Write an enzyme that holds these catalytic residues in place. Structure first.
Site, PDB file in Angstrom:
ATOM      1  N   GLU A  35      -4.971  57.829 -35.508  1.00 60.23           N
ATOM      2  CA  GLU A  35      -6.017  57.559 -34.622  1.00 60.23           C
ATOM      3  C   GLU A  35      -7.333  56.600 -35.311  1.00 60.23           C
ATOM      4  OE1 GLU A  35      -6.597  56.401 -31.437  1.00 60.23           O
ATOM      5  OE2 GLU A  35      -4.898  57.595 -30.920  1.00 60.23           O
ATOM      6  N   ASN A  46     -10.949  46.389 -27.092  1.00 60.24           N
ATOM      7  CA  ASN A  46      -9.414  46.776 -25.568  1.00 60.24           C
ATOM      8  C   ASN A  46      -9.814  45.216 -24.136  1.00 60.24           C
ATOM      9  OD1 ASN A  46      -8.241  48.914 -27.102  1.00 60.24           O
ATOM     10  ND2 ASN A  46      -9.889  49.778 -25.991  1.00 60.24           N
ATOM     11  N   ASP A  49      -8.904  45.653 -20.865  1.00 51.63           N
ATOM     12  CA  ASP A  49      -9.891  46.285 -19.726  1.00 51.63           C
ATOM     13  C   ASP A  49     -11.152  46.172 -19.738  1.00 51.63           C
ATOM     14  OD1 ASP A  49      -9.576  48.351 -21.662  1.00 51.63           O
ATOM     15  OD2 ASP A  49      -9.403  50.221 -19.737  1.00 51.63           O
ATOM     16  N   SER A  51     -12.780  47.486 -22.188  1.00 55.11           N
ATOM     17  CA  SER A  51     -13.902  49.265 -22.997  1.00 55.11           C
ATOM     18  C   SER A  51     -13.311  49.288 -24.112  1.00 55.11           C
ATOM     19  CB  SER A  51     -12.926  50.499 -22.232  1.00 55.11           C
ATOM     20  OG  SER A  51     -11.576  50.923 -23.025  1.00 55.11           O
ATOM     21  N   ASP A  53     -13.239  52.348 -28.198  1.00 56.78           N
ATOM     22  CA  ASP A  53     -12.371  53.310 -29.059  1.00 56.78           C
ATOM     23  C   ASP A  53     -13.508  53.850 -30.313  1.00 56.78           C
ATOM     24  OD1 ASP A  53     -10.048  54.337 -27.352  1.00 56.78           O
ATOM     25  OD2 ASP A  53      -8.943  52.254 -28.377  1.00 56.78           O
ATOM     26  N   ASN A  60     -12.352  56.840 -25.736  1.00 64.48           N
ATOM     27  CA  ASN A  60     -12.158  55.935 -25.047  1.00 64.48           C
ATOM     28  C   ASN A  60     -13.519  55.168 -23.928  1.00 64.48           C
ATOM     29  OD1 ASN A  60     -11.478  53.985 -22.010  1.00 64.48           O
ATOM     30  ND2 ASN A  60     -10.525  52.899 -23.649  1.00 64.48           N
TER      31      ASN A  60
END
Length: 130
Positions: A35, A46, A49, A51, A53, A60
């Site tokens: 990750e 991202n 969309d 958002s 991480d 997220n």
């Protein structure tokens, strides 16, 4: 902070991650490596969309933490997303646990499915004293 392998292993064990809801330490170690490469300040925007991480587990913003700039987001771990960029991971861990309490469990992370599910992950904690 970018953690060293075994250093991260004991840090997670101390925080009660070993076997949390049936999830072994090796699997959690596998998740963090893939990750964020063990980096607590890791970030991923991202654009699709809108958002982000955040941190060592790449949690997220659209569902788990609030950053205020994500459209139609929720805050399931009731944390500022900023808490996930700390060198100390106790808050990330409290949120990583909240996530797996849901039905999917650790599978909530798709990359986990890609690189950890049904894999030999012993290597992640071998030699760590856990």
């Amino acid at each position: 902070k970018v953690f060293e392998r075994c250093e991260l292993a004991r840090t997670l064990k101390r925080l009660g991650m070993d076997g949390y809801r049936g999830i072994s330490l090796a699997l959690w170690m596998c998740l963090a490596k893939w990750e964020s490469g063990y980096n607590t300040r890791a970030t991923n925007y991202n654009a699709g969309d809108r958002s982000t991480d955040y941190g060592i587990f790449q949690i997220n913003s659209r569902y788990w933490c609030n950053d205020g700039k994500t459209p139609g987001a929720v805050n399931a771990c009731h944390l500022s997303c900023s808490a996930l960029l700390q060198d100390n991971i106790a808050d990330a861990v409290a949120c990583a646990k909240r996530v797996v309490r849901d039905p999917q469990g650790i599978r909530a992370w798709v990359a986990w499915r890609n690189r950890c599910q049904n894999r030999d992950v012993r290597q992640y904690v071998q030699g760590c004293g856990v």
